[PDB]
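Table S5 (text form). Sequence records supplied for joint modeling of the four-component complex.
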Amino acid sequence: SDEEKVRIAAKFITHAPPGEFNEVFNDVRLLLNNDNLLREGAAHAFAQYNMDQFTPVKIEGYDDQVLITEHGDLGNGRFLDPRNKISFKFDHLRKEASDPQPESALKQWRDACDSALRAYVKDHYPNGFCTVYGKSIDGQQTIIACIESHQFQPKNFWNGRWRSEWKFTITPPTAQVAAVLKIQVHYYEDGNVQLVSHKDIQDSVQVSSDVQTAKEFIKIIENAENEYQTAISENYQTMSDTTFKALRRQLPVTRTKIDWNKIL
Amino acid sequence: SDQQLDCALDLMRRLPPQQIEKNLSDLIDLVPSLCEDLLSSVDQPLKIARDKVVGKDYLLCDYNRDGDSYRSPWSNKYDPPLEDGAMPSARLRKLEVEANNAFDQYRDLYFEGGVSSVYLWDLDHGFAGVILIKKAGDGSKKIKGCWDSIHVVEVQEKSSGRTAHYKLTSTVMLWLQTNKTGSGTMNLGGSLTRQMEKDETVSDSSPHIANIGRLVEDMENKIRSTLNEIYFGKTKDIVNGLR
Amino acid sequence: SFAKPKGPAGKRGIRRLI
Amino acid sequence: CDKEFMWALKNGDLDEVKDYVAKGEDVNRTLEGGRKPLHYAADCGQLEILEFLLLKGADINAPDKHHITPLLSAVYEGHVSCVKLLLSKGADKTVKGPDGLTAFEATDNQAIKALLQ
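The corresponding structure-token record, covering 642 residues in total, follows.
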């Protein structure tokens, strides 16, 4: 009932909606009422939350924000900005970057994909950021493209965030595609409503040169994300006309409101 | 303690609404001091019990509880057995049975299923009651959902019984889930609480139950439209503004 | 806004769930 | 279980409906909610479910406990494509609903009214 008291605090913190980590952490801290066990118990919950959320951080001296992901985790509190070829310490609590330090067989494909993804995210997301890794996973060269986009409007009582992660396992002349897309929205003006959605994608495509393939990777990503976003909007209509109705109708089958006298 | 109440209520507004029960369990486990104050302010999804005399389902809340036992609206008996459990008056129990029957038909006409229950108690200058409705969406691997609604109504009589003031506090808890190929897994979860005061004439033709019935019907109709068009529609617009 | 009516009087036991 | 069958019918889970037929169940039995499978599909505009149920012997003119036919259900709820499907499959559009009016007389929808003329 002491370890478990901090286990509950970690779970609460990792389930904070996007753009609401501060308010949730305030609540968790005031309720546990001892920052000692919280620190040595909920340290991992801060790192887990940031890497799960694709948290974007601005690094002084560099224009393009970088995402905090598990793929950039170098261990020992440092993360990698593969675009700017730097590592840096990241304070998961403060959400601040510091100590930038300079940092190859996948350099060509990573830069090509990075350049193509950055043009896509710029033209197709409002305030989007993206980070592209190139690493050898179990002896197989892998490109991992990560996209994040969020709108935080507490003054209107809502926040939203898009995350997508595209893993391309390059085994020429083919590549295996593993992708997950995620949307989370919270609107709480005189109420409380949350949308949580995710979509898993698995497929294979053809590859050729580094530049031509990166253009085709971005085309596959654009179409697959268009299809996901469009399908979600259409599904609102379906959930509002059908799934909701299957729980409670808007009107009875006779399409007339109830005659309470006849019942009585 | 008192400030921790502010933080516990805030945390419930931010944690996913589909885990109200598990979150309140973990929250009370964390701070046992709030076990009484939480449950009095945040409504939980309703649990169902089977009346052992007549074999009909009924819903559990604090208003029909006495110790560790719950009173059935059908048989008016506590379960587990209580030798001297709190009962309504004979006059109010008669009203309670009529209200259960009326809202049972209401439930059938708007929900086409589920369970409904009504419990009344007496006040110094009138009476109060709760209307509980639970409707689960089960029978599909791909499409799930559940509706829980709770209506607390207060009745105050006046004009020698020709008019009455009704105070209504309603909470709807709703979640939906679809697992499709285009949109993947989509989870929509909500809770909405609203209130409504009203004077209505009480007569042979417009009795208390008809007034309460029209009041609850209008509120659930209004809350359904609000959940759909203002709240769910807003999250859609947020989605289309993320990309 | 306004308060809910007081619960039934003369009831033993504290509040709990499930 | 009728509660679960109704939920699958209303939400267009065609696989569950197939399992219901495959288990040798009756597509013309009135469910415990008081309507037939065609009514639940038509009430929620489930075009694909309607087609399958008709192909498995469902009575396109059977009334429910409200004395509503499948076609009237699709008209009342404004499901144009389902109205068109049921008409093309021979649904008697002359049956009077529980208010005495036919589908054409009762519909406030113009696109549907044009299909019933």
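Note: Chain D has eight helices and no strands.
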